[PDB]
Design a protein around this ligand. Sequence first.
Ligand code: W2J
Length: 165
Amino acid sequence: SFSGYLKLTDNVYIKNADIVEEAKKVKPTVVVNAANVYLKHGGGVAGALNKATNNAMQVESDDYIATNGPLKVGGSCVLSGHNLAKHCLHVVGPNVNKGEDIQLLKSAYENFNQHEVLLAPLLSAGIFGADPIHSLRVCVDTVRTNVYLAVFDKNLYDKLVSSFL
Ligand SMILES: C[C@H]1CNC[C@H](CO)C1
């Protein structure tokens, strides 16, 4: 039921869309969150997804952290998708603004391979500070399952499509 996506490869699709609106429309089995190790969904994609859940994502996340401790950079956990999806896969890409190793972006994308189909943002893009062109490249070269990428910014979406090798 994903509609309006441009096909980049055999398994990677892209659309200029607000991932919250896309999740509400599609109700995918998995929506990926651009999480941090503490699951503190303050801003960027995480802040927007959490706000769409009326903070239920944050309440669930705080209980998860209280039980399990923080995630690793490059790691993930599966939690509820609330009103957005069946599940939310919280994936921690490296935050270059915190000096985290950009080489961990491939490990972060490997989490997507545990799910046959996902709605996702570009990991480490936006407020995480990585080059979104590089994130898309790592995505296509790492993810083998079906990934539907939602890119919020039209100007960035156009740049990503027009520069895609
Ligand atoms: C598994 C269902 C979850 N919501 C959308 C799916 C259609 O691609 C069906």
